[PDB]
Write a protein that binds this ligand. Structure first.
Ligand SMILES: *[C@](=O)([C][C][C][C][C][C]C1=[C][C]=[C][C]=[C]1)C1=N[C]=C(C2=[C][C]=[C]C(C([O])=O)=N2)O1
Ligand SMILES: *[C@](=O)([C][C][C][C][C][C]C1=[C][C]=[C][C]=[C]1)C1=N[C]=C(C2=[C][C]=[C]C(C([O])=O)=N2)O1
Ligand SMILES: [Cl-]
Ligand code: NA
Lengths: 543, 545
């Protein structure tokens, strides 16, 4: 009732998913029959750069690499539900992959929003079902021109506006380390698939952490570039024309060198000609390969989200190993974080009170992983305001987010956009006054229980700050939760004692052994330097 | 009710008078010490050769500086283009970094380029007596490149105009003809450079403000992609408007000068001073290419009827390019009326003009602004009523009026997305024809004083490229003949509304004035845009190279 259309969409989506997996399995079995000899485990454990080298040299055939990864992806999907669709014609793309491409023969996984000709990009939304893309988005075209073979679409939380990973069409994606845990999101299918060995390279998008959450939660590396470093042309989205806080797309992979190779392959004449709106900045190898001592700003906490004990240890140990390696570590925290999060980020993301975003959910189910976000956004402006006034004395954080999610005039949007611009210049000035090269920060972890990110909005603080600032930011795994880390979490209080702090403690319970990351940041357009820094952390923390 | 604005104007005029007297003193002192200096020779050297002689030591920075200062003072007498002498610039002179790419080059600045210790009034009382406390980023970079910024030049009040008068410093006049506008809003730059009083200047452009004064005054100007150069520290009058991006860029006597200025600005100094600007070095090889181009072109945008001189300029340039072996392909960006009336107008005035109007509270409104302020002040419901009445007879006026109404953030998002889609749509057309560059008419010849504010429609040629955010430059290619001028009597405009009527009259009596064409390339392709401009300059006015 009011859900007949949504129910029919889910029924067809599930049958498409099921038929996709069956097709993959058929293809894999056929291949294995003809190739009983192939050492599949050796092939799967090769770091991407080595895989690429052997594909370029002919030591490994693209078919062997393709079907071996296809088989692994099908297998790890069993326990994770990360795959929504097999990009069918990728078998033919395989046979015609450009031979001198930088990614020749490399199977690549795609977050579902990367439009692929002939396939839906549903984003888990009933209204996007049965609407196959007319063509590949630009970054998909460039991947193919560089010889890569995009082979699957991976799951996202409904609408993508979430750091969990469930929707009413394909269901819930689970963390491959612990099935009761979220894989993070919104690029959570990617995180789960790459984190379990089913893909050597993937693409995600990030507006509040959506590349970094799943990378950290699933123990892999991820980079969110400056928003306009790579082309978003052709991507499927759910809000259009919101430019205060820009969406960014970037790579996810098992190591830092893979992220660098992916960026190098994307930043080519092909991309710059297909999307003239992206500045034609080539990948600067000399910056990325540099090995000079860095001035590293760092903070153990943002005073907003109290770090978990494992987060704090991860940060301090990384700081200490960097110092031992000759880098200079400088205490540094961007000024006015609560304003950046509550006023600028929230205000920019929801300038219209959520009406545009809400159009997506009309007649649809609302996935439990979204929590009360939809119900809150639907509230009348006067009531959001009233409710905010009431909450303010007891729970200022909740009050602040709520008041800043109201609709406003174009006049007020200009003012907010100007404040965003000035805040960016403020942090840049602060940075330059300490002469920083890069910035090391905590990263949210370990993974939260399924269906809890929707109830812990405050915890986007570590990531969304750099969307607001539009600085490149990436994450690197550096440790795993210990018994002691996990025991200490039982004393966690947070700085506010509101529902978000309380949920986080419970949602992080039972995490021994899960991966924990740190975040590496550089200035706008300095992706190469940001990756150089990530590489240094990777060398020191996972030797 | 105006004592405030009257006091402001009195102080501003005194400050300008004192600046000019300071210049006169400095110039005379220098001349007495250098009676043998061949100033005409020095003033007529193309900037490239001027730069070379400064770099080798053949000319001293003092000789170049004081000779240009003198010329600037002299041409100011008939144009009123200089508002302020940037006083500490003589000390910058003696400290200019010796290896800088602009070592010893005097540079003029549009008044909005913040310079420590000086107002950037924009012709507005509310900004008078509030001196900047830091050089803006592009000014810091010029200085780091050894250039010597030396004057602030006049703008129309608020800058939101293609004429050039304000109540503080008064009206700037075209150096070719004192009854004509020098264009704007970078009009002081146009008049100063166009009359030989500066070898290089910086302007800004949101609807044509670099390109109009370049064209009206017969010089070269380039409006890059909006974020190619740093706007950090500029003085503005509307903040946070990002649908139609402001751009800053160089103005000069020849194309090579624009290229040199861009090359000097696009350096590590700028990219470290403003990390928000993508660090794209000037690609010398693209600028210097001699390969044949595929050149899209149009002789009319079907929105503003071109003057007979504009049309002739365009067709002659087209034919010389064809003769030089380039491929000329007819091309017109789709949906121009929609891009101007809905996207550009709605983008510039999304809030009904409220933020803009705050600047005028308690101020005189310069006559060159026409009825703009009066119209913007009208109640949204009345703009809507008047639009409906006007629609049947005067669709164009009705449309502008309807799209200057205030709206929600929700509607602004929708508009921003339509802008993004429109950009991609024109890009797709361009790609489908495999264009390298695009040749278009440029508004000219110069309009009579006080008429640009009453001919808003004529921004069509230039504003389209702020909407699209493509680099666009102008190059002088001919002058109005008596034949071209007599033909204005047959000019009707496509609409016959007040804007066409004003334009017809405003473009008459222009014999001998310069006429330009406009050169366009894709976003971030300034070097290719400049390569095409250099080709046009060479073919139409070979003696400039
Ligand atoms: C992720 O970056 C989203 C991660 C969760 C952010 C939640 C922030 C929040 C702030 C204030 C109140 C509640 C929550 C990601 N990937 C894609 C997107 C996204 C979001 C909106 C629109 C689009 C789009 O149109 O493509 N993408 O977020
Ligand atoms: C010039 O580009 C202005 C050229 C005239 C454009 C008139 C377009 C128009 C008028 C009326 C109705 C519809 C369209 C220029 N230089 C600077 C600026 C400018 C304008 C506004 C704000 C700012 C700023 O804040 O720096 N600059 O316009
Ligand atoms: Cl940009
Ligand atoms: Na008018």
């Amino acid at each position: 009732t009011g859900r007949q259309k949504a129910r029919g969409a889910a029924t067809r989506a599930r049958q498409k998913q099921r038929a996709s997996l069956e097709t993959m399995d058929k293809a894999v079995q056929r291949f294995r029959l003809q190739n009983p000899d192939l050492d599949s485990e050796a092939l799967l454990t090769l770091p991407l750069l080595q895989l690429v080298q052997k594909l370029q040299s002919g030591e490994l055939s693209p078919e062997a690499v393709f079907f071996t990864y296809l088989g692994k992806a099908w297998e790890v999907n069993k326990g994770t539900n990360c795959v929504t669709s097999y990009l069918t014609d990728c078998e033919t793309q395989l046979s015609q992959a450009p031979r001198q491409g930088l990614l020749y023969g490399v199977p690549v996984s795609l977050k579902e929003c990367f439009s692929y000709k002939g396939h839906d990009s549903t984003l888990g939304l009933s209204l996007n079902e049965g609407m196959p893309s007319e063509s590949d988005c630009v970054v998909v075209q460039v991947l193919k021109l560089q010889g890569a073979v995009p082979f699957v679409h991976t799951n996202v939380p409904q609408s993508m506006f979430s750091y969990d990973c469930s929707n009413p069409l394909f269901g819930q994606t689970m963390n491959p380390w612990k099935s009761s845990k979220s894989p993070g999101g919104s690029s959570g299918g990617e995180g789960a698939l790459i984190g379990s060995g089913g893909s050597p390279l993937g693409l995600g998008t990030d507006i509040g952490g959506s590349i970094r959450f799943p990378s950290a939660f699933c123990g892999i590396c991820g980079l969110k570039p400056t928003g306009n470093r790579l082309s978003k042309s052709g991507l499927k989205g759910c809000v259009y024309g919101q430019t205060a806080v820009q969406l960014s797309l970037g790579p996810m992979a098992r190591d830092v060198e893979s992220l660098a190779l992916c960026l190098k392959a994307l930043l080519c004449e092909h991309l710059f000609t297909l999307d003239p709106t992206v500045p034609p900045l080539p990948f600067r190898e000399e910056v990325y390969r540099s090995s000079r001592p860095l001035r590293v700003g760092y903070y153990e906490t943002d005073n907003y989200t109290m770090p978990s004990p494992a987060m704090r240890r991860a940060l301090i140990e990384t700081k200490q190993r960097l110092e031992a390696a000759g880098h200079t570590l400088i205490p540094f925290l961007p000024n006015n974080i609560p304003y950046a999060l509550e006023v600028l980020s929230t205000g920019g993301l929801f300038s219209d009170g959520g009406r545009s975003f809400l159009q997506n959910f009309k007649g649809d189910f609302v996935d439990p992983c979204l929590g009360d976000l939809i119900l809150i956004l639907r509230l009348p402006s006067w009531f959001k305001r009233l409710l905010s006034l009431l909450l303010k004395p007891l729970f200022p954080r909740l009050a602040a987010f709520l008041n800043n999610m109201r609709p406003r005039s174009a006049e007020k949007l200009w003012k907010l956009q100007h404040e965003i611009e000035m805040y960016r210049q403020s942090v840049i000035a602060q940075w330059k006054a300490m002469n920083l090269d890069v910035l090391l920060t905590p990263m949210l972890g370990p993974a939260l229980d399924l269906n809890t990110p929707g109830r812990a909005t405050g915890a986007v603080s570590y990531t969304m700050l750099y969307n607001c600032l539009d600085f490149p930011a990436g994450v690197v795994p550096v440790t795993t939760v210990t018994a002691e880390d996990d025991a200490q979490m039982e004393l966690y209080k947070g700085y506010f004692g509101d529902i978000w702090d309380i949920i986080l403690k419970k949602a992080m319970k039972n995490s021994v052994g899960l991966p924990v990351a740190v975040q590496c940041v550089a200035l706008p357009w300095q992706e190469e330097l940001c990756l150089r820094f990530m590489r240094e952390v990777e060398q020191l923390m996972t030797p």
